[PDB]
Amino acid sequence: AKAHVATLEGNYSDIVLGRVVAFGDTGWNFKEVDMTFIADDADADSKTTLFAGVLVGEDGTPATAAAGVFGVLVDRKVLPGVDHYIGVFEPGEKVPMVLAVRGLTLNQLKLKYADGTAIDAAGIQALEAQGNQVTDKIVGTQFIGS
Amino acid sequence: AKAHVATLEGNYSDIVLGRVVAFGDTGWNFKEVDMTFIADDADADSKTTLFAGVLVGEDGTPATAAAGVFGVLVDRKVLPGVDHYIGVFEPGEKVPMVLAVRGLTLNQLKLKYADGTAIDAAGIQALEAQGNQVTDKIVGTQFIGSVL
Amino acid sequence: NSSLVIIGGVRKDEFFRVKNNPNSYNGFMEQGVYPTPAIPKQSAWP
Amino acid sequence: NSSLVIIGGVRKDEFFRVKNNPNSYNGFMEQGVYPTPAIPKQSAWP
Amino acid sequence: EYGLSVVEKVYTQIAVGEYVGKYKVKNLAFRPQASLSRTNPIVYNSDGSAIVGIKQSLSAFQNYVIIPISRVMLMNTGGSSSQALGVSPLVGCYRAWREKILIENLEVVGATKDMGGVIELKIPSQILNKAAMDPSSPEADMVRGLMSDAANAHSGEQSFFMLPSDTKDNAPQYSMTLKGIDGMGKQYSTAQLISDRKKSILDRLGAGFINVQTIHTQFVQRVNEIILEALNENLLPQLLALNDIRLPETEMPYVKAGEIVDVDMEGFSKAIQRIGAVGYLPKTPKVINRV
Amino acid sequence: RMSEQGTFALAKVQVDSERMKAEEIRWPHLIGTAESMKQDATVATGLDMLYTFVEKAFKDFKVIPGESEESKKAAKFIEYCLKNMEGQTLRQFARDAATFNEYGLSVVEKVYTQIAVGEYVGKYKVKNLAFRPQASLSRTNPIVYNSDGSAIVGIKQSLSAFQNYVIIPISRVMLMNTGGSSSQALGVSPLVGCYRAWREKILIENLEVVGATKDMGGVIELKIPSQILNKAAMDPSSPEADMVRGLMSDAANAHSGEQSFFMLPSDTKDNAPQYSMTLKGIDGMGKQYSTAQLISDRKKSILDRLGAGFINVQTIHTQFVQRVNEIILEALNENLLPQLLALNDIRLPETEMPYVKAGEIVDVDMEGFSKAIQRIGAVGYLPKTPKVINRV
Amino acid sequence: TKDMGGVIELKIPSQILNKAAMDPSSPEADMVRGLMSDAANAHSGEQSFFMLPSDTKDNAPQYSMTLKGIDGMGKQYSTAQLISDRKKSILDRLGAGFINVQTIHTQFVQRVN
């Protein structure tokens, strides 16, 4: 007797805790990269594995170690709760995406590699080379009590 | 008889002439690390040898070589005229210190190594790599010479 | 021994998960005698 | 045997740690029936 | 607000008009207190006897000097003639304002933190621990259900609670109680603290009647007279000197400010009759124009 | 001598005043914070009552001429121009001008046009007193000064207002502002000060709604041995399962009526009974702060700044309206009329300039006025003129 | 400022508190750090509640949560009326005591004149 349930976790403004607002423009911090949305083999049914907060390389391929780290995926099309894209893309279809690179404050608890592993020291210093304040001074990491 | 008198000269802005202020986290330019305040093997009232403007590596120890520089110590606890933290810490005790890292218009003449030696070209390169501008010219002042 | 004490309403993650649940029924749904369009029928905000 | 007794709000280091936590939800966020721009959505002061 | 006010008089010649050849006043240029010198605003003699001028900061001449005393009209209040920097009416209020603010802050946080009647649930730790280490066990599902059901627990048409009644010791395994303050609440009644401080602040400005000839009307007359003294005794004699109109003391005209309280039509109309019915009111156009 | 020795420092007095404000009420943001206020039912009401009497005053306006014959002709032409704007009336202008009570500032541009056919053919009317909304102005610098911060050269309007979905010289613009001295171009909105109180007032009202919803006093609690609960969960087709499903529906419908009662087994295993039914209550003391009087203090705090605090129960409210009327009249009497007469080369002495007089905001008392005329009239101090006769 | 009536008090077995102090990377340490932040933010709202273990070792329970209150009687002197008496005491010497509510104040001014 299923009781259908839907859920979400996190926002856009919890992976990016703050910006540096370049007066001269608004696109200073970001870079636009092109990636494959739906898996290369899965049918046109699978919600892709691009949860916001994954680390991607310079050419858009998802990161796997500290070596291939360039930016943090923050595109609106993969934010939690944004799930009306299921059949809109064919397998292997390749779409632009947005990465945040420069002058940003980053939550250390959200950053992950493509597999799911949490970011490590090597990845932290790699990102922090771009001028990103990777910080772990977050309040809210324990829910309700239990 | 002797008149015990003192002078309170000194300032903070001389070490940080300007900052890039982010509309988000205003602490984007700083980092906190645990340095040793009182000398490890000295007595209980041996006030710290640390002074504002000393280069500090990421490990927290005061820098001794250009390659070991990561930031500038600008902690409030070491600024001139407020250095009353005398005998308040045990020898060798750790304490979090504020370091200035990126987005600063520093003053070259006030950057010095652990022993007080002035910063060199390699140190300038290493410190500017973070995105810092190390100015080499502050006007200075001449107070009273009877001539100028 | 990691989740002995649970306090509700002190986390954004836990607040929105309950708030956005389509099956949730909260206090702002008190229809009373007969239903009126002045009272929401869904928990999540528009 | 060093941290038996804890009292909150009596240290600046601890007070700002909770205040600046992006996940914190405190009493000043009581949105009520529907959200209004007169009530903050973040714990930290501007 | 600042105990002090600086106005500079500038005169100009008339080109075409009724009084061609004479000198008007171009502007009574207000010098803001904020743009003045922050170090010494007012400069004296070699001794502390008199004033020679007023200094303005050099930073006010930029976009994003000493003015002689003879050109400046100084107004100040709250002090004697020997206090160039007058006492602002906010001096005195300041300590009360500091307290008034702090108390209001305590009321807001106090009302938010009065968790009376909050729901507390007690569950054996065997279930809590099993869920934490076995996310795919029946204990985990029930724990996740509680975390959402308890958050939504309001009062309505179907609100109730059903708990197991097992017992292991003098205390039961499962329970549900609503908390309350075990003792006595707050005593100081911060409401009347604020009211006393508000009346403390408004009294210095004569506007304390809002907490409910008068005090407020008499207070306004003080400010009017100070301005009129500067206007009557510093500008008018100098203005006539430039246009060489030299008169005796008894022939100097003066400026009279308006009336701050409106005339009572009922009172005035019946006052004219009582004087008029006897014949003590002269027949002049001045009386006629008053209607 | 005849030489200025200082500056008004318009460009500095502003830049200090923007720092000394909470950041949600600085220029480019105050435009949004005003319209996100107003939707408070005490803030709207204060502004609405203020505009009620401002419109009334500028409805039955009058132009008062001088003594000479020249002034009387000029007064008639002024009345025609002010009552014949194409698509505009002074009531609409008054209710647009009075917006500085929301934003500290108001901008009106004067446009003149020639007459084609009419009583005054060849002269110049005023086409429209074009209101420039504060929201359509420049968000960066709205007002531009000299190379120094001495005076104002014009007002800038954003380029985004010329689209569907530039600097205007100061000589063409009529500026009205309130709450500040002559050195504050961006006047202090009366909502500055109120803001902190409005923030608190809102938060408290939110706590009352959630607090009343969550006061589960007297809720029904049932205790059942866990043997029955566990058996039902694993045996959906067992007698325990049927009784559990019955309880989940019967307990929800448990109201008070003509047949309400409870019947429970009385078994006992320990000091506590196996089955029980109790109605919960707060074990201690309830809330203490009485949030009701907190809100009342903040409401009177907000309305006092607008002079409309009497609704919480010559006056303060009537005197407050006169302030707004006088500010508008100064701009109308001293910026438009002298320029309007200059275009039609009507040059008069100072004593012969006509002026516009606003109407009366308080209605005349028939009882008081009628018996006031008799008392003056019975003595003979009231002149026999058509002016007195027409007053009836 | 010091009338801490209704303040929240928590009781936890000292085994958890001591383990956290000596093992910063143990599950006890994580839960202790969570309590120090969750308890500070514990206000009253739409989702406020408490859930504690119900274990028992002796006549007293292992875990508990109570709101404190003054165990006895509060203050008695009512410092409010003390101040009012002294204010009227001061203003009477200047003849301006009527603000606490030919006159006394008018006659006092004539003396100075």
Task: Describe this entry's structure for a reader.
- The structure is cut from a larger assembly and holds two copies of chain A, two copies of chain C (46 residues) and three copies of chain E.
- By secondary structure, chain A is mostly beta strands.
- Chain A contains one helix and seven strands; from the N terminus they run E-E-E-E-E-E-H-E.
- Chain A has one helix at 121-129, and strands at 16-19, 30-36, 55-56, 71-73, 94-100, 104-107, 133-135.
- A four-stranded antiparallel β-sheet of chain A has the order 2-5-4-3, with no helix packed on it. In chain A, strands 1-6-7 form a three-stranded mixed β-sheet, covered by helices on one side.
- The longest helix of chain A is centred in the last third of the chain and has 9 residues, at 121-129.
- The radius of gyration of chain A is 16 Å and the shape is globular.
- The two termini of chain A are 27 Å apart.
- Chain C is 17% helix and 0% strand.
- Chain C has one helix at residues 12-19.
- By secondary structure, chain E is α+β, with helices and mostly antiparallel strands.
- Chain E contains seven helices and nine strands; from the N terminus they run E-E-E-E-E-E-H-E-H-H-E-E-H-H-H-H.
- In chain E, helix 1 (90-112) packs antiparallel against helix 4 (190-203).
- Chain E starts with a strand and ends with a helix.
- Chains in contact: A-B, A-C, A-D, A-E, A-G, C-D, C-E, C-G, D-E, D-F, D-G, E-F, E-G, F-G.
- The interface between E and F is large, with 77 and 82 residues.
- The PDB classes it as virus.
Outline:
This is part of a larger assembly, with 2 copies of chain A, 2 copies of chain C (46 residues) and 3 copies of chain E. Chain C is mainly α and 46 residues long. Helices cover 17% and strands 0% of the residues of chain C.
